[PDB]
């Protein structure tokens, strides 16, 4: 569900 | 700059969680299990990359291009490491352990299995160390291969140089002759180059399987596959 950029950017 | 030992310990702690995938195999169900597994691993791979020191100081475009470029090589070197002490077996995950002959279930995959097994066999013969494995997996990410992707580029060079220095330091601790240390380093680097070539084959094969509607490809794996 979660994309490369969202995974890279977040948390 | 960290010390080489500080750097190696950061790489250890960066290691991703292990994943489990969960009838006898058809072409369809084997690819489903392997693609499901790959997609889960990819999620953890991004978190791992973010723990490699310096990685998140690179431009976001570099971070993206580094991962698009190396993700299959990283999956494969992980597989080789999990499989290193089991001749003839690919330990894809706990509860997904495949004998060499099980590649016969999927068109084209047996050639790739044999290449993965032969490379794993060279790592075994070399007696690849835990510390060396950590360094080489990080070097793969940081573009030791030098695929063509100023400040982010300069930083990246620094980061790759630091991990190379750490691998050199690990090799130096073995106490073997300077000649043998150089040859060991060359052999490991030539093996990384081979993993890149196996990765190209893997990518090809997955794109073929997707095209022939043999297996669906969704989500992060689809995103990463779409970049090749
Ligand atoms: C990409 C393929 C499915 C996913 C496989 C996988 C899946 C998980 C993993 O940790 C490593 C590998 C390497 C071999 C990959 C395969 C090579 C061909 C096939 O399409």
Nearest CA in chain B to A11: B47
- Structural domain count of chain B: 1
| Distance separating alpha carbons of residues B47 and B60, to the nearest angstrom | 14
Method used to determine the 3D structure: X-ray
Number of alpha carbons in the 13 Å side-chain half-sphere of residue B178: 0
Q: What are phi and psi of B15, to 5 degrees?
A: -60, 140
Q: Residue B38 is part of a domain; what is its CATH number?
A: 1.10.565.10
Strand, helix or coil at B25? coil
DSSP string, B186-213: HHHHHHHHHHHHHHHHHHHHHHHHHHTT
**Contact flag A2-B220 (C-beta cutoff 8 Å):** yes
Mutate to test the pocket of ligand 1, among B18, B37, B75, B220 (most ligand atoms within 8 A of CB): B75
**Of B7, B142, B141, B9, residue with least CA distance to B76:** B141
State both tokens at B70.
Answer: 């190396």
B93: containing domain: 1-228
Query: Is the shortest distance between the CB of B34 and ligand 1 below 6 Å?
Result: yes
Residues of A in contact with B64 (CB under 8 A): 4-5, 8
Q: Which position has the token pair 């993700």? A: B71
CA of B74: how far to CAs of B48, B50, B122, B183, in Å? 11, 14, 17, 23
């Amino acid at each position: 569900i979660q994309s490369l950029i969202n995974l890279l950017a977040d948390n | 700059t960290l010390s080489p030992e500080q750097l190696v310990l950061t790489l250890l702690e960066a290691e991703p969680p292990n994943v489990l995938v969960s009838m006898p195999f058809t072409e369809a169900s084997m690819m489903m299990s392997l693609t499901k597994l790959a997609d889960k691993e990819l999620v953890h791979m991004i978190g791992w990359a973010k723990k490699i020191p310096g990685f998140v100081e690179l431009s976001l475009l570099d971070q993206v291009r580094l991962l698009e470029s190396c993700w299959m090589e990283v999956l494969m070197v992980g597989l080789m490491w999990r499989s290193i002490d089991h001749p003839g077996k690919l330990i894809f995950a706990p509860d997904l352990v495949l004998d060499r002959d099980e590649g016969k279930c999927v068109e084209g995959i047996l050639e790739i299995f044999d290449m993965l097994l032969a490379t794993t066999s060279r790592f075994r013969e070399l007696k690849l160390q835990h510390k060396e494995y950590l360094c080489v997996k990080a070097m793969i990410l940081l573009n030791s291969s030098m695929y063509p992707l100023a400040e982010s580029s300069r930083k990246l060079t620094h980061l790759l140089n630091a991990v190379t220095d750490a691998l050199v330091w690990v090799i130096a601790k073995s106490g073997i002759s300077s000649q043998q240390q150089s040859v060991r380093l060359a052999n490991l680097l030539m093996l990384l180059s081979h993993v890149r070539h196996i990765s190209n084959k893997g990518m090809e094969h997955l794109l073929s399987m997707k095209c022939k509607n043999v297996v669906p490809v969704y989500d992060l794996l689809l995103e990463m596959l779409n970049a090749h």
